[PDB]
């Protein structure tokens, strides 16, 4: 579809069996999800945002459905105010910016 | 243009008569640039993102050229890790997300 930017570009995603709302963020290099108890092994990581760094948990090869489009990749889980779908996954669903 | 997301969506902007590089950020509500001098009065403001809040200077109705397209709106200046073009200006140049 085509998403305008008058408001935050929020979409429905499916991960670990749960449906959530996530922001399509072209400015984010990685995908960061709100704290959730995902199964599997993970490794610690520090990611930097506008006002500093936060500590997150990195999970690899996690299947995720974005607005009906299947994708699979790395997901970082930590104390984020909102779920963020970054470029690592946006490229997978063939998302582009146009003007 | 149509921009893919395999690489950071960076573009050249012209502001205050100077050239700079900036990130097209659909996850950013406002536009924030690195510390620099801008003509006109400014008001102190606080914006929050991942990592926390930072103090910035708000300049209103500032003309800015983004990749050849003209826009005139609010521009925040402060200790941001990188130059970001948010939705307030992206909407002015008719930017949309597509997939
Ligand atoms: C989700 C987040 C959000 C928080 C709270 C409410 C809504 C969205 C967005 C994110 C922003 O799109 C992308 N942002 C641009 C600057 N660079 C910087 C960067 C680059 C390189 C780095 C680094 C940090 O650290 C080490 O290397 C960080 C990047 C970011 O936060 N990335 C991760 C992977 C951690 C998610 C964000 O910060 N948004 C705010 C925002 C932004 C600008 C102006 C106004 C406002 C208000 C908000 O909308």
């Amino acid at each position: 579809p085509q998403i305008t930017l008058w408001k935050r570009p929020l979409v429905t995603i499916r991960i670990g069996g749960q449906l959530k709302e996530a922001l399509l963020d072209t400015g984010a290099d990685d995908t960061v999800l709100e704290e959730m108890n995902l199964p599997g092994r993970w490794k610690p990581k520090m990611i930097g945002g506008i006002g500093g760094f936060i500590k997150v948990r990195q999970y690899d090869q996690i299947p995720i459905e974005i607005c009906g489009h299947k994708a699979i990749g790395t997901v970082l889980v930590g104390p984020t105010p909102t779920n963020v779908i970054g470029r690592n996954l946006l490229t997978q669903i063939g998302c582009t910016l146009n003007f």
Side-chain angles (χ1 to χ4, degrees), chain A residues 21-40 42-84:
Chain A
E21 273 183 288
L23 182 69
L24 299 190
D25 196 353
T26 57
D29 294 325
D30 307 295
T31 290
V32 189
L33 302 182
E34 305 181 301
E35 185 54 50
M36 70 185 306
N37 217 9
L38 282 177
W42 54 266
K43 53 191 295 181
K45 183 192 185 70
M46 295 284 269
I47 58 170
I50 271 299
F53 282 76
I54 58 167
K55 190 177 172 186
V56 301
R57 295 188 282 96
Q58 182 189 316
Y59 292 80
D60 299 307
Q61 297 303 308
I62 300 293
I64 184 173
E65 191 176 293
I66 304 168
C67 215
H69 291 250
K70 296 178 173 301
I72 187 172
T74 300
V75 173
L76 306 182
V77 179
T80 176
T82 186
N83 296 301
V84 185

